[PDB]
Structures are given as C-alpha cells and as structure tokens.
Design a protein around this ligand. Structure first.
Ligand SMILES: OC[C@H]1O[C@@H](O)[C@H](O)[C@@H](O)[C@@H]1O
Ligand SMILES: OC[C@H]1O[C@@H](O)[C@H](O)[C@@H](O)[C@@H]1O
Ligand code: NA
Lengths: 339, 346
C-alpha cells in the first residue's frame, strides 16, 4: 500500500507498507526517510512534520551533500584550482554547507512495482550553488520491498568538473524511543581501520589507524557500551563515536555492518568504501523526538560514503566528479526479525 | 474557501474562491499563478499539471529571478566588481539563468484572513547560485481578496551585496482559449517611452525611444491588433511586443495599465518603474494549453520590474541589493466588470 499526504510547509509524506505490514516513509524535504516501524515500534529516529526538521535538526534521515562530511577550510581542488565551498561550521564546509540539499523540497515520482515500490526524488544543484561547480542533476531513489529491504540509489551528472559524495543520514534506534541509549545494541562492522579526528573541530587528523585491539574493533560483534565506555583518546574526544571506518572488503554483496537489539537487526550493504558512524553525542541537548527527550547516545548513523578527509589523505579516495560522467551510489538497509 | 491538492511531481495546487465566486490558483513550483477564472472562463494561460510546465514551458505564470529579463554577457557590477552570471541564452543571462527559481519547489504557508487569503512561498537562493552572491532569503506572497485583487508581494534579504529584480510572468488571454489571439483586446498603458532591443539577441540597444503617436502608443486605449499589424522596426524584429515600457508616473496608486475584453478588464498597479510586455510571439509553435493549440499572439504579459538593460542604461535604474537590506516590491492585478464600453469585432 502507498499513501501520500501533506507533511507540512508544502512538503509531502510518502508512506509505504509492504506485504509483511512493515511501514517506511519518506518526504521530499531533503529526499529523506522519516519513519521505519515494525509492529508499531520505530526502528529509526524521526519527526512528525516538516517544521520539526527545519526547526530542530535538519539532518536526521536526510540525503546530505553534495559532499558528506567535513571539508577542511571549505577547500577542494578542482582542475588544479582551489574552490572555497560555503563554510557552515567555523571554517569547515559540513555536509555541503548552509541551506544545502537536505533543506530543499525535491521533486519526485513514485513507481509501484508490486513486491517493490520506488520513490525517485530529483533536484538540480545550480552551477556555483554553495561554491560547487555544476549544474548537477541529482536523483535519490528510495525503495522498499516485501523482503524488508530499504535501498538508496543515487545518480548524478554534472555539466562541469566538480565534487560529489553524498550520503544518507538516517539514525537508528531500535529501542524505538530517543530517550533510550543505543548502548544496549550490538554492533558488528567489517572494518579494521578508522580515521582519527584532529581535535574538537573534527577535521581529519591526517592518519589512518589500525583498530585491531581497540575498543573500536567491531569485526566481532560487540555491545556499543564497550565503545561508549572506552578511555580511547578518540572516544573521549567526541564523547562517543563520530568517525569514518574503512571497509576491509568493498562491494554491495557483503554485509558491511549489523546492528542488533534482541530479535531485531539491521544489516548494511553499500558500494561505498567507508561508513561514517555518529552516535548522537548530544549530551543534555535533549532534542525532542515523538515527545521523547533525546538522550546522549540516543541514536546511531551508518553514513556510507567515500571517507571525509580525502583532501588531506588521498589514500581515502577521490570524490571528483568529471563533467558528463554518471555518478552512481547504492546503499541498502535490511531489516530482520529473529523468530 | 481554500483547497489544496497534489499538482504533480511533488508540487501542490492551492485553490482559492473569494466571496464573489471568482477562483484563482497557484503552485509552489516556481511560486506561480496557475489559473484565474470568472464564470468558468480562464483569464490567464496555464497548464493542468506540473509536468506540463516543465515539459512545455516553465515560465508561464511563474515568479522569475533573481533578475528578470536579459543581462548582456551575464555581466553585472557588484560593489565595484564584475560578476558573470549563469549564461543560458547565448552569452546572456535570461531570467536568472538556467534552472532558476521558476523551476524549484518553494515551501509555502497559507494565511486565511477571511476577506483576503495569502499564500506565502519561500525559497533560499544559496550564495553563488547561478553566480549570484548571497545567500538570498526570498519570499513571494500571492494573495486574493473579496475585491477581486490578486496581489504579488516580494521580499528578500541577502547576506552579501548582490543584484535583485524579480517579476511575475503571468500571461493574460481574456478569450479563455490559447488558440485565439489577444489582438481583439484593448490596451491602455501609461507609458510614453520604450526600450528598443539591439537585434535578435534581444539585449537592449542602448537608447530610450519616445513612442507617442506610434503604433506602440497605448496611453489612450487601442486594440492590440494596432501593434501587431505595425511594421515598425522593433515590432518586426520580435514579431510583436517583447519590450520594456517606461512608466510615465510612478506609484502603486496609479492604474498603470488596463487590458479589456468585452465587459471584462484587468487593471495593473505596481511600485516598479517599468512593465515589460511580451505577446507570445511564438509563430507556429502551437504549445498546447488545455488541448488548445496556442496561436501567435495568443497571450500577453505585464512583467512589472526595473527595466532590463540598466547595465548599459543607468537611467533605467539600479538593481543592486545591499547586504542586509530588505528588498520589497508590489504588483497588483485587479479584475473588474463593465468599467467601460468595449464592443469590438475582429
Ligand atoms: O553528521 C552530522 C552531525 O555531525 C556531528 O559531528 C555534530 O556534532 C552534529 O551536530 C551533527 O548533526
Ligand atoms: O520572457 C520569456 C520569453 O521571452 C521571449 O523573448 C522569448 O522568445 C520566449 O521564448 C520566452 O518565454
Ligand atoms: Na505538498
């Protein structure tokens, strides 16, 4: 079943219920996931209207870009030339800058394929928008299937050499309530390295660190409590996790990560090289979600993308997008229920 | 009464009915007017869904900007420095460039005041978008009242010094059918001067021409056919009208123009200094409007704004916008019946 309704400020809410009766919903404000529920229990964090996102936090569930993450001093090099992108966090360009793609109303079209339903959101980033060369014609297709598979398929094409590395900013919280820490969830992650941050500004420090024998080694499932409790300089620095993890084996077929709570689990697949994990290290902020005051550690992201900091650590990758080249990205979140 | 519904591609249609029973409609796709009807007769040109605007022509009824009209070589001078804007028509920047504001989904909120209903559309033009310094927080409020007044109120504030001069691209056609030429309509226009274009590229020529007593003199109402039939150089150049007219007297209180067909008339008021008129000089194109093949001269605009060409003709004005200054503009289109006695045949 498909249902579309007003979500506020002219935005729409497209709700998809699969054969199993699982519900997922997205809004064109930011080509964003709003909710994901099973048996009346929320799996992710989300708000109840457009205003909340714009007033409270515009990142949750959104498509963020054109470049996800922090870009040092807002600087990228394009065709040997420096370009300063819009600076929204101190001198850094965070998730594409101020009033980026996550705050725009994207156009969209729904395609019902039976066992699968797709919602194709579209938006054009004008040449020069927030400093980014273009125009960039972008699309983000969010699909939901009878097997409880939520897929994100990105496509983009630029009229000019530019940079492109968007991501999905959903926050999971299998407790189905923001006031409950994800400390009790188990996390498995197929990455043997992480990218340390330099300091409170959060720019990449410059090195790649081996995570073997650290509280950040999740190759073997472990309770997030372990990481939250760690004395690791990197953990103390952010008061949780806020880092890029480097995947050991690339390709969409491999289950890159798994998040579990009791009988419920979410598997992560992507064709991207890294997963940026942020554990909602908000302290006392207490942002309200469904009337629940959010707790420190009340959520966790799995931002599949090329790792931030490639401007300083080329080994991480190259987010360059040449004119006329067809950018593609695929990320899958698969829901399972232990029976 | 107000109604809302999906208009296609995620856009919405906001429909108003005033106490007199007059209906008007708008979509957030380009903070645009979609229809205006009197007794089941369309007063303007418009399509039936969002895809038609995007597939056929994205300008009709839209809010265009940041700068309406043609900017030669896309060059503007901002606070002493030159900036090249997006070039979408040869080397010119036409209507703010490619995939501009008329093509975005603006957010909106409706305020019901009873006798008047306001539909405020909002959009942020990021710093650097299409070459424009910014960021610019814009809003376009389209309102309709029991007095048959359709008002357009623009507001904007930029973070940086930039340029700003948007307009409303509504096309009237009192025949209620695009396949019927507006040659049969009477036009009165309070302008003694116009701005000639250089050639087919349509940039301004450089001079201001006096049009008194020519076929482009509408001070005293005359049929549009007088202009269309004219062999004046400027008319032949564009195959009709596609020009800025300079208002002789400024102020929102003055009826600057009036378009009449039989008992129906549209009056134009504005706080802007010129009205750019385009008479849908599409020749044999035939874009379909409600399944009607649009005819050459099947429509007419009254885009109130600062005349295009101030880059070469400083006398026309200055479209610059200082960082932190609040820009405002107001244009009103008012519907009336039996104001005068328009009984003609063509
Ligand atoms: O990824 C986005 C998040 O990045 C974190 O480093 C910040 O502390 C959050 O405020 C922000 O929402
Ligand atoms: O104002 C926009 C209009 O300008 C005219 O000069 C062009 O010929 C039209 O195709 C265009 O829609
Ligand atoms: Na809507």
């Amino acid at each position: 079943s498909i249902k579309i309704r007003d979500f506020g400020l002219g935005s729409d809410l497209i709700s998809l219920t699969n054969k199993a009766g699982v519900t997922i919903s997205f809004t064109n404000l930011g080509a964003r996931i709003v909710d994901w529920q099973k048996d009346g229990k929320h799996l992710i964090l989300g708000f109840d209207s457009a205003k909340e996102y714009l007033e409270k936090d515009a990142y949750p569930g959104a498509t963020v870009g054109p470049t996800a993450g922090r870009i040092k001093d807002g600087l990228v090099k394009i065709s040997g030339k420096d370009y300063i992108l819009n600076q929204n966090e101190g001198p850094q360009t965070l998730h594409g800058g101020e009033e980026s793609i996550h705050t725009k109303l994207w156009t969209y079209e729904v395609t019902d394929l039976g066992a699968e339903v797709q919602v194709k959101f579209s938006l054009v980033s004008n040449d020069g928008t927030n400093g980014y060369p273009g125009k960039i014609e972008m699309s983000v297709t969010h699909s939901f299937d009878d097997d409880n598979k939520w897929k994100i398929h990105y496509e983009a094409i630029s009229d000019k050499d530019t940079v492109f590395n968007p991501t999905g900013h959903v926050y999971f919280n299998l407790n189905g309530d923001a006031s409950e820490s994800v400390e009790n969830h188990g996390l498995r992650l197929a990455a043997s390295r992480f990218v340390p941050l330099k300091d409170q500004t959060e720019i990449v420090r410059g090195d790649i660190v081996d995570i073997k024998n650290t509280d950040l080694d999740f190759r073997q499932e472990k309770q997030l409590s372990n990481a939250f409790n760690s004395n690791m300089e990197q953990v103390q620095l952010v008061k949780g996790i806020d880092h890029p993890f480097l995947l050991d084996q690339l390709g969409l077929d491999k289950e890159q990560a798994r998040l579990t709570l009791d009988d419920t689990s979410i598997s992560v697949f992507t064709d991207q090289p890294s997963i940026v994990i942020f554990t909602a290290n908000f302290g006392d902020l207490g942002t309200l979600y469904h009337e629940k005051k959010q707790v420190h550690h009340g959520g966790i992201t799995f931002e599949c993308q090329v790792s931030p900091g490639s401007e300083q650590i080329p080994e991480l990758g190259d987010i360059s997008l040449k004119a006329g080249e067809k950018y593609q990205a695929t990320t899958i979140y698969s829901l399972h229920t232990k029976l």
